[PDB]
Amino acid sequence: PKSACSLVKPVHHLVKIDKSKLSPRFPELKYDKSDIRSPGFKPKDTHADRLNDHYLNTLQSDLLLINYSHNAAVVKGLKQRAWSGDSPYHLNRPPKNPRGSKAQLPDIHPIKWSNIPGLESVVINCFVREARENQLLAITAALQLQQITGCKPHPIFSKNDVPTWKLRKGHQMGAKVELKGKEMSQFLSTLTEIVLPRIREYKGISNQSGNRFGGISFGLTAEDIKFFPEIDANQDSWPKTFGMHININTSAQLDYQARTLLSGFQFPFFGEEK
Amino acid sequence: HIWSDFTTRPSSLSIQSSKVKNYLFQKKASLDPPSISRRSNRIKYSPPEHIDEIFRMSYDFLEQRSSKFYELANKTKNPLKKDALLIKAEINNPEVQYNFQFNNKLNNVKDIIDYDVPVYRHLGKQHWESYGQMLLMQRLETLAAIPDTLPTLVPRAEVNIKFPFSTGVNKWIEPGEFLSSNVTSMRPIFKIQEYELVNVEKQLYTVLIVNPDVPDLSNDSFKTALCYGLVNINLTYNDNLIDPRKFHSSNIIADYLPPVPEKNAGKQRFVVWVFRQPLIEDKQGPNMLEIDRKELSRDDFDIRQFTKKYNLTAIGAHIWRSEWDAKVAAVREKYGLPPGRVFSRVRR
Amino acid sequence: SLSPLAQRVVTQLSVMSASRKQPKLLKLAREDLIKHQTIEKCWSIYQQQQRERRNLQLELQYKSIERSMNLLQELSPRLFEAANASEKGKRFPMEMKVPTDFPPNTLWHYNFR
Amino acid sequence: TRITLPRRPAKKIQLGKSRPAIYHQFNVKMELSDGSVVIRRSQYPKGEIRLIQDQRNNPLWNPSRGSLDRFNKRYSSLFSTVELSEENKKKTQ
Amino acid sequence: SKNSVIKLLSTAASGYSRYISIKKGAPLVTQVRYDPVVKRHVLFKEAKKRKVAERKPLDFLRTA
Amino acid sequence: RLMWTFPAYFYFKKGTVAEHKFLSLQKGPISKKNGIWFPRGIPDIKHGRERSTKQEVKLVNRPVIPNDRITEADRSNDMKSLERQLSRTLYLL
RNA sequence: AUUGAAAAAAAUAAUAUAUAUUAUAUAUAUUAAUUAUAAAUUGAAAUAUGUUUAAUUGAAUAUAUUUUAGUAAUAGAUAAAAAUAUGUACAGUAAAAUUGUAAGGAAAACAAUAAUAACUUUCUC
RNA sequence: GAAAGAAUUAAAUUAAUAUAAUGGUAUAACUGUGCGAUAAUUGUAACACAAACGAGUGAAACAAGUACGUAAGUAUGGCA
Ligand SMILES: [Mg+2]
Ligand SMILES: [Mg+2]
Ligand SMILES: [Mg+2]
Ligand SMILES: [Mg+2]
Ligand SMILES: [Mg+2]
Known part of the structure; x- marks a missing residue:
């Protein structure tokens, strides 16, 4: 290396040169993942999503x-x-x-035909803390997640280090999975109908729960996961079972709007609202 | 059923292959694809299930849309809008898609891909934008053929060059190639493929091959050199290969002088520029222009000044670049050019 | 080498993994490929149209609401005030359930509370 | 001390050749507490399930609409309300 | 001594050789460099012998 | 067509009564055998599936029988009834 | 090519074969593979050859020949967990603080947190 | 009027840089990824900076060969 001086030279034309297209290296990668010719192809719109249809029609x-x-x-x-x-x-x-905060906050728009609140994404964060001892527990948790969702989980690793809790840095510990579109909708429907009613003293989701902007969350214990039909059908195959956090992300401007939306999909809300 | 009709619509929108067309439009998945030439491979092959009925429904849907578009298209008077409407109508036609994708665009056969047809022309433009145009732009910027000759380019026509007469071999020159002096000994052949809607009868073109990198030792810098200059050339969407057949001796403002780089003078860019003429109203037929042949000089040539004088607009470009080899002396001798200089290896 | 627990973990891992479980690539003929493209494009267009229809309907509803509320403001101020309240804690009723695939045994309940 | 599964050399997925994980899924019919059937895609092999405790029989989701069992069985002749009234003097507490 | 010196001898038998430093138990260090006697890039290999920190050869063939 | 193989080894344990029934329900793929022409290519098999094709996996104790979506009211065309259309939004006129 | 089903051809790219040129070109043919690799007295499957049941096919069962099962993570040009610290090519953006969420607590993980004027394409009134 | 794209603006170098401190770094010098593992190569090095000498530093160019890159080019170890 003669130098480390980075300095992008200006050009003399307004045509946007896609450099990827000029190579002949990754011919399969030039196709979009939506395109049939790509190895990354997956049938997206396989069947009519029920919760989404309901939202469209009634809600x-x-x-x-x-x-x-x-x-x-x-x-x-x-x-x-x-x-x-x-x-x-x-x-x-x-x-x-900013005045109160260190980070800037977004503008809250009036709700019109364009920006009506709706479900954006679900994320199912499962961090098993016994997996500081046993790596195999993380794997089992990931499998459970996969079973529940029908979607590929991603492994969570210990980002931090701490002595009090016996936790190293860079250790596989549970898993997560961002559901989107139809699988997410299905998962929500299952939660509403099968799982949450089988929880004994279940009042609902707290009204004090949530982000400041269109995001609501809650969590399920290891007791609650055995009500999922994929786990329930083979209790011999599932001796251990792990709790999970469930981050619901809406297209809501504020949190009360998001709560209202979730209520529309048969989620009960119990606590005193902010 | 607008896409089955060929009363007013061109023949090119249909598939010319009969077997392929039959395969496309059947009532059950009984036949086997004409693309798979081999019997064993056909036997092996299995198309995805239920594809036929859905395909038919999709065709009907898009055919209906096309028909609806056509209802608007015929009422429209102004030409660009009409063309756009026509494109909208036919772009989703399976047959035209088949035609375009799976047959050559460079040397298009008129019956398959007709560039007189607006949809096909649009497709060709889109294809050009996807790869070839970007590449050309990169080669112009990297080699520094834009600011050094002619400030900018807004690529409109796809320009491809060839050197058929010198050697014998057939090869379209990739932009920014190193060609031998044998290869570029005799003149090149251009193909200016135009994708915009333009008056084919009236619109003339000029083609200028310029060498910015010939050394001037008085200035201690370089000077330009007009190596080949044509004017008042007539293009047509399908009939567009600029060959000694087409252009006359009157069209040649400066007849082809070959690349003869000097030893150690360095790599010399030869960047062809394609301009379209200024179109004059209230005058039927092609409006010519006279060039002052004593005024423009070949050993030193202000391209930008020339453009300003004749009110040209650069639509296309292509570039190769030659450097010294053993045969340049032979080329000079053939052309009757002088022995050719030899410079010091060091740029002191 | 491995314990029974280790084996079972490996099996579980395999369930999730793509190792020796996935088929050949979906290759098509050119005609077939075209047919597929035409199917997909048409579908996408249809979906867009549907979205526009729904979006348009929503816009129309919004306009109607706006028209109503202006009129209410003009006529009866108290009624307008009553209409335009903060509906922060508004909850959809738990009877308005997400429509199933097939209906129940008792389709509709005529008595309540 | 830390129980692990030690990793083998990872298999190189080439760029472009990565394929999406389409897991094997069956169309599974769930009949809820009442006779409302719903189809859902599921990884476990069972075409039909019928559920006992759902939202459709939970009081929270519709407000408007075996020790105990053993006890009932073996104190059945007595028939165990009237019994409550008989055995509920609220003076002593 | 943590880092030792070694002699890499050219594989094209010119006699040309280049010297480099390595950690005491480092893997056998072969490198392709210019041999000026031959006027090309050739392999260089360690002339002397020495002990190495024996790594377990990672198995791509799925064992057991 | 693109779906993975069903990992039966997980859901069904080897040497079990439940597995056996599943096996009986299933039919296996035709393996490659030397000295024979397979005019639909040579069988590519892993975990007992033809990789070149789609896989089919055939599967109180009671069959889940869903109710008819069309109703008695719908058949009769009773406009005053609420059960007359189940897939549409009804409005009181 | 033989086999199934009911005259030909006109891209790119790859592969095979041939030749053109002090031009890594062209011509003809064809569209393979694409997440695999040794080693399994035990699981599972197929085919072949027998025998018994309702010339026949299904069904059952025996032997032979194979095939599968070694079940192991990345599926994305991955993007601030940890790991190859020098080259090159392509691409992206961190952190803090805040609001939440099963055990989780000041301190484990996951989510969310600045502005869209103009432009291009698509659908639509 | 909506969806998608291209993005632009604002902010940021407080994180991160094998390692001190300082200067530099988002056009990233930071981070991820493909290939690679070659330039952590061979002879001449002008001219500068610095400088008593001995040394030290940046380095165009010429020639031989190599690696990556469609190309332009980049690499004579590491942001300094
Ligand atoms: Mg600093
Ligand atoms: Mg001085
Ligand atoms: Mg000195
Ligand atoms: Mg560094
Ligand atoms: Mg570096």
């Missing part, structure tokens, strides 16, 4: 009707404030961080 219109506030304008979030130029030291100064 979406109802949600819109609920969320109509008359002549509602945009509520701007907390942003980085600029300095008043009352001193020459303000001249190339970085902007003041």
Whole structure:
């Protein structure tokens, strides 16, 4: 290496050169994953999604009707404030961080026909803490997740180190899986109908639960997972079983809207709302 | 059923192969694909199930859409809009897709891929944008053929060159290739494929091959050299190969002088530029233009100035680049050019 | 070499893994490929149309609501105020269930509470 | 100390050749508490399941609409409300 | 001594040789470099013998 | 066609009564055998499946029988009834 | 090529064969493979050859010849867990803090947290 | 009016850089990934910086060969 000086040279044309296309290296990779010729092809729209159809038909219109506030304008979030130029030291100064927060917050828009809240993604985080001792427990947890979802899990590793809890850094410990589209919908439907009613003293999801912006969550114990039909059908094959966190991500501007949406899909809500 | 009709619509939109067409449109998956030539391979092959009825339904749906588009298309008066409507109507036609994808676009046979047809032309443009155009742009930028000769390019026509007369071999030159002096001894052949809607009868073109890298020792820099200059060339979407057949001796503003790089003078870029003429209204037929043949010089040639003078717009480009070899002296001798200089190996 | 627990873990891992469980690649003829493309494109177009229809309907509903609320504001202020309240904790009723594949034995309940 | 499965050399999936994990799934009919059937795709091999405890018989999901068993069996002749009224004097507590 | 010196002798039998440093129990270090006697890139190999930290040969063939 | 092989070895344990029934229900793939022409290519088999083709896997104790989606009311065309259309949104006029 | 089903051909690319040229080109033919690799007295499957039942096919069972089962993670040009620290090519963005969520607690993991004016394509009033 | 793309703007170098501290680094010098494992190669090195000498530092170019890259090119160990 003669130098480390990185410096992209300017060009003399407005044509956008896709460099990937000019090579002959990865001919299978030039095709989109949606295209049949790609090895990455998967039949996406295999059957009619039921929960999605219901949302489209009944709920979406109802949600819109609920969320109509008359002549509602945009509520701007907390942003980085600029300095008043009352001193020459303000001249190339970085902007003041937001008022309360360190990070900037998004603008809350009025709900119209375009931006009605709806389900975006489900994530099922299972971090088994006994797997600090036994790596095989992580594998079993991942399998369980796969069984539940019908989707490929991704392994969670210990990102941090700590002595009090017997936890190393870079150790496989449980798994996660982001469900999207039809599989996610199915999983939600199963949760509503099969699993959550079989939980004994189940009041619902807390109203104090959630993000500030359109994200709601809750968790299932190891006792609760044995109600899933894939696990239930072979209790001999599943001696151990692991709890899980369930992060539901909506297209909701605020959290009460997201809660309302989830209620539309038969999720009970019990606590005192914020 | 608009796509089965060929009263007003061109013949090129159909598949010319009968067997293929039959395979496409059957009532059951009984026949075997014409693409698979071998019997054993056909036997082995199994198409995906239920594909026929769904395909038929899709055809009907898109055929209906095309028919609806055509209802608008005929009412439209202005030409570009009409063309766009026509494209919209026929782009999803399976037959035209088959035709375009699986037969050559460079040397298109008129019955299969007709570039007079708007849809096929649009497809060809899209194909060009996908790869060949990008490559050309890269070669222009990297080699520094744009700012050094002619500020920018907005690629509209696909330009491909060939050197058939020198050696004998058939090969379209990839942009930024190193060609031997034997290869580029006699003149090249252009193919200017135009994808925009343009007046075929009126629109003339000019073609200029320029060598920016010939050394000028007075200036201690380089100068340009117009190696080959044609003007007032007539193109047609299908009939577009610029050959000694087409252009006359009147069209040649500067007849082909070959690349003869000097020893240690370095690699010399030869970047062909294709311009379209300015089109004049209220005048039927092709509007010619006269070039002052004493004014423009070959040993030093302001391309940009020339363009400004005659009001040209660069639509296409191509580039090769030659350096010294043993046969350049022989080439010079053949052409009657002088012995050729020899420079110091060191750029001191 | 391995324990029974280790074996069972390996089996479980295999269930998830693509090792020696996946078929050959789905190769097509060119005509077949075209047919597939035409199927997919048409479908996509249909889906887009459906989305637009639904979206359009929603827009129309929104416009109607806007028209109503302006009228209400013009006429009866109290009624308008009542209409335009914060519906923060609004919950869909638990009877409005997600429509199943096939219906139940008792289709509709005529009595309640 | 840490129980593990020690890794073998990983198999090189080439770029472009990576294939999506399409797991083997059966179409499974779930009959809920009431006779409402619903089809769901499932990895376990069972074409039909009928459920006992669901949302369709839980009071939380529809508000508007075996020790005990053993006891009932072996104290059946006595028939064990009237019995509650008889044996519920609320003075002593 | 943690890092020892070694002599890499050219495989094309010129006599040309290049010297490099390695860790005491490092794998056998062969490298392809220019041999100026032959005027090409050739393999170089360790002239002397020495002990190596024996790694278990990772098995791609799935054993047992 | 693209689905994986059903991992029967997991769901059904070797040397068990449940496995045996499953095996009986199934039919195996034709293996390659030397000195024979297979005009549909040579069998590619792993975990007992022809890789070149789609796999079919055939499978209180009661058959789950779903109810008819069309109703008595629908058949009669009773407009005052609520059970008359089950797949559509009914509006009171 | 033989076999199944009921005159030919017109891309790219790969492969096979041939030749053109001080041009890694062209011509003809064909569309393979694509997540595998030794070793299994025991599991499972197929085919062949026998025998018995309702010329026949199904069904059962014996031997032979094979095939499968060694069940092991990445499926994405992966992108701030850990691992090859020098080359090159392609691509991307971190952190903190905050709001939550099964055990989880100040401290394990996962989720979420700035703005879309203009532009291109697609559908649509 | 909607969906998708291309992205742009703002912010950021507070993380990360094998290692101190400082300067530099998102156009990334940081991170991931394919190939590779070659340039952690061979002879001449001008000219500069620095500099009492001895040394030290950056390095165009010429020639031989190699690796990656469609190409342009990049590599004579490591952001310094
Ligand atoms: Mg610093
Ligand atoms: Mg000085
Ligand atoms: Mg000195
Ligand atoms: Mg470094
Ligand atoms: Mg480095």
